[PDB]
Amino acid sequence: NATEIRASVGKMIGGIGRFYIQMCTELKLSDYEGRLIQNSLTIERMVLSAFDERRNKYLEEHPSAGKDPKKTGGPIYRRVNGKWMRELILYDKEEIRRIWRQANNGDDATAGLTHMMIWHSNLNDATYQRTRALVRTGMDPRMCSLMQGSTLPRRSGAAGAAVKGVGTMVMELVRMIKRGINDRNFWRGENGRKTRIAYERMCNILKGKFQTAAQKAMMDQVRESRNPGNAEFEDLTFLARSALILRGSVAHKSCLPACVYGPAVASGYDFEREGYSLVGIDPFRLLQNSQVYSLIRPNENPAHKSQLVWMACHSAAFEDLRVLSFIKGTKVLPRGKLSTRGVQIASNENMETMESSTLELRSRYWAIRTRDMRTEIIRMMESARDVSFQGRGVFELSDEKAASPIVPSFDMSNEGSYFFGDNAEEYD
């Protein structure tokens, strides 16, 4: 059945590629402009915005975009006489939807919208810090390493649920508990009945992420509370801290930008026939046969901007840096050592100083990713407790059948956390 599962994922990637090729053709973008990641993000947000209809399911937007709910837009960058120009494009949401369905042979293809949303989340995880929002909710700033998918939309649903991390679930459940404390009727009536289902859904989602019997049992007690007060917060926090040692089951999906699938489809690659799997060589091979460009700000180091995108492409912001340095072949520095700022350009930035760089997104090897008395038990379980790769090893790109595993070497002395010494901008 894994052949039938590979065909369905391949169909979805091909439609994203076909949708991008169409959008580039409407906008009259060049090969360079089409391969600019800033343009890709604009094009990807436009389709999410057109299909969202302000539901906060695939995206969240500024009230300025709410001026005309029937139109969606964003910034487009074109290269005019060596310089870079920024223009705002406004398309009809109906026409964007029409183009998406046409690219997906009449199908709604919600699987492709989610993939771009998950790539967008992975990019924010690789770019912005969340330590101020942790302090705001009353959580430990050290919980940074468990904030997978913390930027995902308000009503992301089942698709966003799989990639959200332990600390992300704890942050939204604690934002929920704190709303009850300051509002008397938060758990009352029809609003409180809807709120109650949302609470138990979030609790069962977080419960499923725990791989021990005691952590899952502790979640049942937080979920059984009809009026969660400070007692439910102390238990959520004490469980969040335990995840920083006793690991959880968090899914990481390598979702590449549409300007990667675009050119791959444009050159005749049949994703539906050939198949596609986010696990293994498929995203690694596609990145070796790709050419992505990015706008670079003055005084920014292009190698560091390339690293931001390579980690976002690979869902690697929360992985051990000693593992990534072995796979990429180059040293993967903590965010605190990168002379770079996020790929998205701000509405007030000077375009005259803006230059561009070729992103270096290839890697040396490829690899497979595989993903009270109760408080006394989990506390004792942490005392059992070094770089860990679980797996046969790494492989070269020529070995596509994984028949020749390479055993990895890491300096356990060298940094393992991307968030150590973090000086990245705070998300907002």
Ligand SMILES: NC(=O)c1cc(-c2ccc(CN3CCOCC3)cc2)c(C(F)(F)F)[nH]c1=O
């Ligand atoms: N799609 C993929 O197979 C893919 C996988 C991996 C990846 C991440 C981590 C590990 C090490 N351990 C972690 C625990 O689980 C067992 C494997 C191996 C491979 C990466 C990246 F992070 F290295 F960048 N990127 C990708 O694209």
